[PDB]
Design a protein around this ligand. Structure first.
Ligand SMILES: [Zn+2]
Length: 137
């Protein structure tokens, strides 16, 4: 009988380990420890992926180049909202589960969001521990 907050925690945790595998994973999580968002850039098609990845399935080639993503350009792509905690208590501040993206970068980050969240809004990263927490002013 686990509720939606724990379910979402579980999904985000499962993903952490998927992203962790390999040298790109290592760059990504090391980057978070330095308050950076690290992506990788395929040299063949120029796509930039977040979280960083070591292979480009579009080109069928290894990716070797890592790039720092401009964290100030994060935006809310889509989200859902959770109004109550897992015991049924109404939250003072609803919790949002958001896909946060960056312009011209493939992928995104599944994050917790709080504030005046709406689609397209700029997101400021408050915590770089996984899963990330962002706010919308
Ligand atoms: Zn490519």
């Amino acid at each position: 009988k686990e509720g939606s907050l724990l379910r979402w925690y579980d999904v985000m945790e499962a993903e952490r380990y998927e992203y962790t595998v390999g040298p790109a994973g290592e760059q990504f999580f090391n980057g978070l420890k330095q308050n950076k968002i690290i992506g990788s850039k395929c040299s063949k098609c120029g796509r930039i992926f977040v979280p960083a990845r070591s292979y480009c399935e579009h080109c069928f080639v290894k990716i070797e180049n890592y790039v720092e993503i401009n964290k100030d350009e994060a935006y809310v792509d889509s989200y859902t909202i959770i109004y109550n905690d897992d015991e049924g208590n109404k939250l003072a501040q609803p919790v949002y589960i958001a896909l946060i993206r960056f312009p011209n970068i493939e992928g995104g980050l599944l994050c917790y969001a709080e504030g005046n969240v709406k689609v397209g809004a700029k997101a400021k990263i408050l915590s770089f521990q996984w899963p990330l927490r962002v706010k919308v002013d």
